[PDB]
């Protein structure tokens, strides 16, 4: 009477599924996407960052962003009823509270989406490997948008939910962290690139070693959760790649566990690296390379050339990307290559 | 099946939001003439935490 | 005593409790109507 009627209404068949997980997902997901659209349409960044980042201020799709709060806010939650805005929606939109709105809602919407994957798999009666593969974007979101500012000064040093703000975030991690030299980052790059490489090779060879090309092509009945895996031959693909590459799969199960395994691991190792970079525990320098650079001043690798480029990124982007520090760098202290 | 009760009144509701100048007052976005004050080249960044609302409404009397 | 922060916390707790009760009350009433 109380509970099983609501449970049978939620798990009922419909256009969209809305389980017990949908009550957490759909308000949080709808409000995160809507807060991003109403922030890039109307909300400025002038009082936090000193920038114009909305369509109302005359920006395109690339240069809009719902920017991070100011550095004097710290790691404050910035609630609408909180002690900073105090119910004022104008001052809440001006102080950067829309960023914390979108970030906390994206967190609970990702929680509700992975609960939705567990619920649909608990219905269909399958193993929930999609919710295990969705553990990697959740770990990337938690390590980047939550753990990295919580280890830094405040919410100001975080990705500011735009396209060009994301490109600024990549240049900031190159300049201030030397994040390309991090081995956890390199495992992340290798996981993503091996996944895309695995994606293209697998698609290329299922579409090639098909059972019926076109000549006696009896179109058999196809079901969608087999993801069309009846239609190709394992033996022809193993015979191809044992002679081309010298190594090939002979399982349809280990091949697809490998496609599950590679970019989730890649994405989990880059999460570990950004969690280390939250405390500025980065992989900046090789110490004996610094000693060899100090020993003779005619020693130059590509790494010591990269350190001067990170020095240039730092000292030229720093008075504008961090305007709360009030950096007054004269032209004589700025690093130039002809100096 | 067919639904034509009010589509284009929402378009004028969106047009009169921006053209009258209501969205600048609701979302706190400054007007394009109203970025800086009439004498100073400073950016009004919030420097406090619990005085930040009074800092922004202290800046908005300079206009 | 009651601070402005504590009173605003009470406002936020009552509005969250409302939204959480209102969503489940609407879902319980809609589930009790469409009872097949």
């Amino acid at each position: 009477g109380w509970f099983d009627i609501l449970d049978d209404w939620l798990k009922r068949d419909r256009f969209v599924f809305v389980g017990w997980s949908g009550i957490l997902l759909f308000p949080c997901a709808y409000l995160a996407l809507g807060g991003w659209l109403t922030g890039t349409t109307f909300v400025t960044s002038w009082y936090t960052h000193g920038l114009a980042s909305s369509y109302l201020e005359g920006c395109n799709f690339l240069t809009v962003a719902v920017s991070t709060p100011a550095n004097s806010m710290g790691h404050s939650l910035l609630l609408l009823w909180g002690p900073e805005a105090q119910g004022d929606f104008t001052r809440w939109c001006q102080l950067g509270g829309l960023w914390t709105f979108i970030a906390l809602h994206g967190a609970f919407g990702l929680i509700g989406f992975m609960l939705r994957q567990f619920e649909i798999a608990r219905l269909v009666g399958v193993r929930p490997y999609n919710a295990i593969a969705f553990s990697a974007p959740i770990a990337v979101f938690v390590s980047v948008f939550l753990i990295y500012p919580l280890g830094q000064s405040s919410w100001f040093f975080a990705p500011s939910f735009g396209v060009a703000a994301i490109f600024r975030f990549l240049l900031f991690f190159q300049g201030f962290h030397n994040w390309t030299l991090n081995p956890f980052h390199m495992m992340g790059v290798a996981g993503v690139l091996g996944g895309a490489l695995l994606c293209a090779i697998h698609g290329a060879t299922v579409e090639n070693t098909l059972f019926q090309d076109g000549e006696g092509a009896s179109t058999f009945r196809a079901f969608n959760p087999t993801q069309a895996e009846e239609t190709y031959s394992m033996v022809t693909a193993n015979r191809f790649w044992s002679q081309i590459f010298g190594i090939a799969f002979s399982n349809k199960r280990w091949l697809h566990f490998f496609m599950l395994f590679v970019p989730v691991t890649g994405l989990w190792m880059s999460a570990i690296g950004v969690v280390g970079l939250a405390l500025n525990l980065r992989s900046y320098d090789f110490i004996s390379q610094e000693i060899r650079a100090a020993e003779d001043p005619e020693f130059e690798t590509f790494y010591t050339k990269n350190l001067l480029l990170n020095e240039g990124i730092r000292a030229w982007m720093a008075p504008q990307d961090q305007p709360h520090e009030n950096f007054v760098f004269p032209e004589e202290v700025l690093p130039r290559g002809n100096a | 099946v067919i639904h034509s009760i009010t589509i284009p009144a929402l378009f004028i509701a969106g047009w009169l939001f921006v053209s009258t100048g209501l969205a600048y007052d609701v979302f706190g976005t400054p007007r394009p003439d109203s970025y800086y004050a009439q004498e100073q080249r400073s950016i009004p960044l919030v420097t406090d935490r619990f005085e930040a609302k009074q800092q922004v409404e202290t800046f908005l009397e300079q206009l | 005593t009651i601070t402005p922060s504590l009173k605003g916390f009470f406002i936020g707790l009552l509005s969250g409790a409302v939204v959480l009760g209102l969503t489940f009350a609407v879902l319980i009433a809609i589930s009790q109507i469409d009872k097949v």
Partner: peptide, 28 residues
Amino acid sequence: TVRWVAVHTLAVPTIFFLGAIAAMQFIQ
């Protein structure tokens, strides 16, 4: 009560925001 909210929670601020964006081009 039905999937008619998909038009009442996703098409109404969409048409409102396209009206705002089409008003935004005729500024200055």
